Design an enzyme around this catalytic site. Structure first.
Site, PDB file in Angstrom:
ATOM      1  N   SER C 272      -7.151   3.829  -6.775  1.00  0.00           N
ATOM      2  CA  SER C 272      -6.547   4.695  -5.772  1.00  0.00           C
ATOM      3  C   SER C 272      -6.489   6.127  -6.264  1.00  0.00           C
ATOM      4  O   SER C 272      -7.053   7.034  -5.650  1.00  0.00           O
ATOM      5  CB  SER C 272      -5.157   4.184  -5.424  1.00  0.00           C
ATOM      6  OG  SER C 272      -4.572   4.999  -4.433  1.00  0.00           O
ATOM      7  N   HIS C 300      -8.348  -1.540  -1.802  1.00  0.00           N
ATOM      8  CA  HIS C 300      -8.927  -0.409  -1.105  1.00  0.00           C
ATOM      9  C   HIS C 300     -10.358  -0.659  -0.674  1.00  0.00           C
ATOM     10  O   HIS C 300     -10.801  -0.073   0.315  1.00  0.00           O
ATOM     11  CB  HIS C 300      -8.879   0.817  -2.003  1.00  0.00           C
ATOM     12  CG  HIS C 300      -7.494   1.249  -2.347  1.00  0.00           C
ATOM     13  ND1 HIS C 300      -6.718   2.005  -1.497  1.00  0.00           N
ATOM     14  CD2 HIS C 300      -6.727   0.998  -3.431  1.00  0.00           C
ATOM     15  CE1 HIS C 300      -5.545   2.231  -2.058  1.00  0.00           C
ATOM     16  NE2 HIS C 300      -5.521   1.621  -3.228  1.00  0.00           N
ATOM     17  N   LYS C 332      -4.426  -1.626   4.179  1.00  0.00           N
ATOM     18  CA  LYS C 332      -5.154  -0.440   3.778  1.00  0.00           C
ATOM     19  C   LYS C 332      -6.543  -0.332   4.380  1.00  0.00           C
ATOM     20  O   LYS C 332      -7.301   0.555   3.980  1.00  0.00           O
ATOM     21  CB  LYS C 332      -5.220  -0.372   2.252  1.00  0.00           C
ATOM     22  CG  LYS C 332      -3.880   0.023   1.657  1.00  0.00           C
ATOM     23  CD  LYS C 332      -3.924   0.153   0.163  1.00  0.00           C
ATOM     24  CE  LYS C 332      -3.721  -1.174  -0.511  1.00  0.00           C
ATOM     25  NZ  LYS C 332      -2.282  -1.585  -0.436  1.00  0.00           N
TER      26      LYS C 332
HETATM   27  C1  PLP Z   1      -1.764  -1.164  -1.702  1.00  0.00           C
HETATM   28  C2  PLP Z   1      -1.761  -1.652  -3.115  1.00  0.00           C
HETATM   29  C3  PLP Z   1      -0.967  -2.738  -3.413  1.00  0.00           C
HETATM   30  C4  PLP Z   1       0.249  -3.018  -2.565  1.00  0.00           C
HETATM   31  O1  PLP Z   1       0.010  -4.027  -1.623  1.00  0.00           O
HETATM   32  P1  PLP Z   1       0.375  -3.703  -0.100  1.00  0.00           P
HETATM   33  O2  PLP Z   1       1.143  -4.834   0.530  1.00  0.00           O
HETATM   34  O3  PLP Z   1      -0.923  -3.458   0.621  1.00  0.00           O
HETATM   35  O4  PLP Z   1       1.210  -2.452  -0.044  1.00  0.00           O
HETATM   36  C5  PLP Z   1      -1.266  -3.571  -4.473  1.00  0.00           C
HETATM   37  N1  PLP Z   1      -2.365  -3.320  -5.261  1.00  0.00           N
HETATM   38  C6  PLP Z   1      -3.153  -2.239  -4.971  1.00  0.00           C
HETATM   39  C7  PLP Z   1      -4.350  -1.944  -5.811  1.00  0.00           C
HETATM   40  C8  PLP Z   1      -2.864  -1.412  -3.916  1.00  0.00           C
HETATM   41  O5  PLP Z   1      -3.689  -0.346  -3.687  1.00  0.00           O
END
Ligand code: PLP
Lengths: 419, 49, 491, 139
Positions: C272, C300, C332
């Site tokens: 990210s 992502h 996402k």
């Molecule tokens: C978005 C994010 C999370 C958190 O999970 P969500 O329920 O989608 O908020 C966990 N790991 C990664 C790599 C993330 O980018």
């Protein structure tokens, strides 16, 4: 030597998943078509349910479904991002205000998930030096933040005063043993107001007055105890009538008796602010979807407009707990107040693996009699204090007693037949 | 006329570098005084030598 | 075929990532910016030996051993509290392309805020995880969940191995398995809760975990909860990967020298921060050389890479049957909530039994299942699979555009996340206010979640962003990067 | 996060110019002499490098290791404890160079020997690798 390392390369690790079946545990995920309402249908068998945790029955309220649909047409479905990075909604702010108002406390955080609201709250405070006193039969969600926070857990026997005081005096021995190190201990006490596994209630005034005698900190985890314990249903603190500000942290989740998703921690604003910076699941995950939120605000409106619902559930507990005792082969090991029974068998067999299978038969026959029940699963090799197999009985307020007593009759019949 | 306005940009440029920007102007002048008086003492001793 | 360079990593396309090293003169000025800021903190906390108002620990019947470390809260009140107006702004609309933001301000110098009444409308956002543009309250895609909402409700009051298991849950777990092209799949409640409750159900006491430098707070936490040795290799450094991977087998534990029980690797598709793609075929070629396993994280990457975007495996054109376990989320790219795990049917069934979450945590809400399904239907074939060709066009346009404008950009060029480098900590605090004046809300990334000389800002591109939406933002940045002289690159 | 803070880029270059500023600040003082400028700047430097390395323990931020280095000062926690690294040796060579220029200036006097040695003494004594965790009756 260079080639000798290549000789070590001829090596096999273990295969990833183990040889799963002990005898043949597949555990049979039970397909429920449609809403799991009061009148539900499981595997094509129509039945009424007795493990669904909508104690207020707010899953089937169209007041709620009209409220969330308005949120659905103006906000969307999910939040594209975590709670910092433009992911905080008005209903998020409205719900945090309401829970502080409903609990007469200062602040209330919101976690996006009913499990990780206490697995992510406890390691925000105790950090490798602090001592936590655990009642040994709290749920598994508590038992992981204690593993995450690398702090020495001191267990004590279940719902059981003065064995905890045995531990406290042992630290008074250690307090006067190294008074510089005892300046930095900041020990804690974790208790659950109504235990999911035993269905009991813990004596808080025998613990609050016990706190200042030994200078500790109390984390309440009223998950089941939230919702219907008080006259308005604020938990054991309304039930015991003791001060809210005695307790350092009150945790819950909006899933039992709110029919929504996620958890919250309300309390005095000296601490609830701190989880915004190090919640570890607060500031690293997606925020709460807003249609769940606006549903949960109306759930607070219904709980505040009508406090009389919390009265009829208590006596409804007082009848199914009364009019089921006296049946052979098993025992009611939940209290009269708890709306989540445990109905484990007396005169236990040998292997629990068979004992589940014996318990499996009663649940199968009862579902054939259009009465749906559970078997109250666990994780055996992890749980670190595992209870014997029970089955949970969960009552709602939409139970209509004349058919509720049918269930107590038809389980009085079929249990002795298996036993 | 704009030379007095162009000059305040370079001062605004001085607010960003060395992080004078979010520095609570109750405290900025305290650093401005420690900026002036050291350079003010740099001149008076420099004229000696 | 493009590169088969040394490890057998077979490349089809050119790779073309860019990690421009920070300039000498820029880096020295940063430490001065922190050095003046760490100076006043000792000044400020010294002034607090008498009594911006604080949270004030209860005096009434308390004053035990104190709760917090005063010193561990240093950076949160002396560098964070100064400029915390941004990355916390409440929005009051659908996070699509233009976002209504409630306006707030503080006369107490960011110590206590206040909404005026204002709703700053039509604000182009570039800080939301809205890649394929499914955040809208319009169209037939979200309309299908309204039928599901009025029918089912908004959440099971039960657990998966307990009562709560709907037909939608059984439908969706099938649906992703065909989407990923793997055997079986299983959805979870939120994407964070997946890695923190399933990775401990895989590895045990004698295992060894080879994770990247910068994974997430998810993947570290699951590695902490499973008692297992954790070893860190450098970011996208296969040479540093293999060096640990070599010594992991030719040695064992540190105490005993027994062999390891099993080992595996935690890597993500698109990181990210510093939006970059992992050198994946050099990983597939290396795990077969050393019999390791592989945990992959398409949080992502899915919906963003490959044609009709199906994660990095189609983007490298490879097979799903060499990745031992695939994980991604639905927040996402899909505009939903939750995550899955894809894998072999033997693996899924073991995790349908040993889950920490199908056995304790409650499952998904019913209508957000439908929002996942209808979104995958528009991908699999109605705002459908044309937008991923739009986003890759938007990615490749925007990525060359700021690079030629004298800015400095990290990561692979095809990565939709745009890490824009600040360096000075005041340039953090000005830039979020500055763009917000120019009708655009972005995300700036602070110090402790970065290294010291990274302190970057970040842009999330979107297929919902058209050209006119994108070029208007290009015009606004051209002034600000001039205004703050943040034109660090040489090219 | 205090383990890669001296292992960064140009921190060595910026560490010099802070001292180089501190001398030119101390060089432009009216009622001072050019020996005791060097005497002053070797005292202040070795005061800073004790207080900022061997006294304050923990992190200014919050550590996700549940406070493992809460009881560890900043020198002890560099590079996760491996002592003979590329950057600890730079931090030991530099006060010696600040000892030798203050040996060169003040013209090798006896009081400038006494005052400028025990500052250089009390900074290298904790930097003995076999003095990793031993703390003298306190802290
Ligand atoms: C978005 C994010 C999370 C958190 O999970 P969500 O329920 O989608 O908020 C966990 N790991 C990664 C790599 C993330 O980018």
């Amino acid at each position: 030597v260079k080639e000798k390392e290549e000789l070590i390369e001829e090596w096999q690790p273990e295969p990833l998943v183990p040889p799963v079946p002990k005898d043949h545990p597949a555990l049979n995920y039970n397909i429920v078509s449609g809403p799991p309402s009061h009148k539900t249908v499981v595997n094509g068998k129509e039945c009424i349910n007795f493990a669904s945790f909508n104690f207020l029955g707010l899953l089937d309220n169209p007041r709620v479904k009209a409220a969330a649909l308005a949120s659905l047409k103006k906000y969307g479905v999910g939040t594209c991002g975590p709670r910092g990075f433009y992911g905080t909604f008005d209903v998020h702010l409205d719900l945090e205000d309401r829970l502080a108002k409903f609990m007469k406390t200062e602040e209330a955080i919101i976690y996006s998930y009913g499990f990780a609201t206490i697995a992510s709250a406890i390691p925000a405070y105790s950090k490798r030096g602090d001592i936590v006193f655990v009642d040994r039969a709290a749920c598994f969600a508590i038992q992981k933040g204690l593993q995450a926070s690398r702090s020495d857990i001191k267990l004590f026997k279940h719902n059981d005063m003065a064995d905890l005081e045995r531990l406290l005096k042992e630290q008074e021995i250690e307090d006067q043993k190294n008074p510089r190190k005892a300046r930095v201990t900041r020990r804690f006490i974790v208790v659950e107001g109504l235990y999911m596994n035993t269905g009991t209630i813990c004596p808080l005034p025998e613990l609050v007055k016990l706190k200042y005698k030994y200078k500790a900190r109390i984390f309440l985890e009223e998950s089941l105890s939230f919702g219907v314990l008080g006259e308005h249903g604020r938990g054991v603190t309304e039930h015991y009538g003791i001060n809210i500000d005695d307790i350092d942290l009150i945790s819950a989740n909006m899933e039992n008796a709110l029919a929504s998703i996620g958890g919250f921690c309300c309390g005095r604003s000296f601490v609830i602010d701190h989880q915004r910076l190090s919640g570890q699941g607060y500031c690293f995950s997606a925020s709460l979807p807003p249609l769940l939120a606006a549903a949960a605000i109306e759930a607070l409106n219904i709980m505040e407009e009508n406090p009389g619902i919390f009265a009829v559930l208590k006596e409804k507990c007082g009848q199914i707990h009364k009019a089921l005792q006296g049946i052979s082969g098993l025992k009611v090991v939940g209290e009269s107040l708890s709306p989540a029974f445990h109905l484990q068998l007396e005169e236990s067999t040998g292997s629990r693996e068979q004992d589940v299978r014996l318990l499996q038969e009663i649940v199968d026959q009862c579902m054939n009699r259009s009465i749906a029940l559970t078997q109250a699963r666990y994780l055996e090799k992890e749980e670190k204090c595992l209870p014997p197999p029970s089955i949970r009985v969960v009552v709602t307020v939409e139970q209509t007693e004349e058919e509720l007593e049918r269930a107590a009759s038809t389980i009085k019949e079929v249990a002795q037949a298996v036993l | 006329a704009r030379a007095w306005k162009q000059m305040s940009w370079f001062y605004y440029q001085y607010l960003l570098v060395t992080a004078l920007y979010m520095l609570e102007p109750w405290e900025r002048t305290v650093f401005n005084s420690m900026l002036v008086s050291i350079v003010g003492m740099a001149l008076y001793t420099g004229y000696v030598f | 075929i493009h590169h088969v360079t040394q490890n057998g990593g077979l490349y089809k396309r050119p790779f073309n990532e860019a990690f421009e090293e920070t300039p000498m003169l820029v880096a020295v000025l940063t430490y001065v910016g922190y050095g003046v800021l760490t100076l006043f903190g000792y000044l400020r906390d010294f002034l607090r030996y008498w009594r911006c108002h604080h949270a004030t620990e209860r005096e009434e019947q308390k004053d035990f051993v104190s709760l917090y470390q005063d010193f561990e809260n240093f950076y949160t009140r002396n560098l964070y509290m100064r400029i915390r107006d941004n990355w916390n702004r409440p929005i009051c609309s659908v996070p699509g392309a233009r976002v209504d933001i409630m306006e707030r301000q503080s006369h107490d110098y960011n110590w206590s805020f206040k909404y005026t009444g204002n709703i700053i409308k039509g604000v182009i956002n570039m800080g939301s995880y809205n890649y394929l543009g499914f955040a809208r309250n319009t169209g037939s895609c979200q309309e299908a969940a309204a039928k599901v909402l009025e029918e089912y409700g908004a959440g099971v009051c039960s657990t998966r191995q307990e009562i709560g298991n709907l037909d939608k849950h059984e439908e969706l777990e099938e649906l992703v398995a065909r989407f990923l092209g793997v055997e079986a799949a299983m959805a979870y409640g939120m994407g964070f809760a997946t890695n923190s409750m399933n990775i401990p159900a895989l590895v045990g006491k004698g295992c060894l975990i080879l994770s990247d430098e910068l994974n997430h707070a998810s993947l570290v936490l699951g590695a902490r909860l499973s008692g297992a040795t954790i070893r860190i290799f450098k970011h996208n450094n296969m040479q540093s990967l293999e060096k640990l991977l070599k010594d992991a087998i030719v040695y064992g534990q540190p105490r005993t020298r027994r062999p390891w029980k099993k080992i595996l690797i935690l890597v993500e598709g698109i990181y990210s921060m510093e939006g970059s793609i992992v050198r994946l075929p050099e990983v597939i070629a290396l795990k077969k050389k050393y019999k390791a396993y592989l945990y992959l994280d398409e949080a992502h990457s899915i919906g963003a890479l490959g044609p009709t975007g199906r994660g990095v495996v189609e983007y490298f054109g490879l097979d799903p049957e060499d990745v031992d376990v695939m994980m991604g989320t639905f927040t996402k790219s899909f505009g939903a909530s939750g995550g899955y795990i894809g894998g072999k049917k033997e693996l899924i069934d073991y995790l349908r039994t040993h889950s920490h979450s199908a056995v304790y945590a409650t499952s998904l809400s019913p209508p957000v299942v439908e929002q996942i399904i209808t979104s995958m239907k528009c991908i699999m074939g109605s705002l459908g699979k044309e937008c991923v060709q739009q986003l890759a066009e938007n990615t490749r346009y925007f990525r060359r555009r700021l690079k030629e404008m004298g800015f400095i950009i990290y990561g692979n060029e095809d990565s939709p996340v745009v890490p824009l480098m600040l360096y000075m900590p005041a340039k953090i605090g000005a830039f979020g206010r500055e763009m917000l004046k120019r009708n655009i809300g972005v995300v700036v990334v602070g110090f402790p979640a970065t290294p010291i000389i990274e302190s970057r800002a970040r842009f999330c591109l979107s297929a919902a962003h058209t050209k006119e939406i994108l070029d208007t933002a290009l015009k606004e940045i051209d002034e600000v990067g001039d205004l703050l002289q943040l034109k660090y690159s040489r090219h | 996060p205090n383990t890669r803070v001296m292992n960064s880029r140009g921190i060595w270059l910026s560490y010099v110019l802070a001292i180089g500023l501190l001398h030119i600040v101390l060089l432009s003082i009216p009622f001072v002499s050019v020996p005791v400028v060097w005497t002053l700047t070797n005292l202040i430097h070795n005061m800073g490098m004790y207080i900022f390395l061997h006294t304050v323990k923990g992190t200014p931020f919050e550590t996700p290791d549940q406070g493992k280095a809460r009881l560890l000062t900043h020198w002890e926690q560099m590079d996760y404890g491996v002592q003979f690294t590329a950057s600890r040796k730079f931090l030991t060579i530099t006060p010696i160079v600040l000892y030798f220029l203050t040996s060169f200036y003040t013209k090798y006097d006896q009081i400038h020997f006494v005052l400028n040695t025990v500052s250089l003494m009390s900074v290298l004594i904790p930097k003995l690798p076999q003095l990793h965790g031993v703390r003298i009756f306190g802290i």
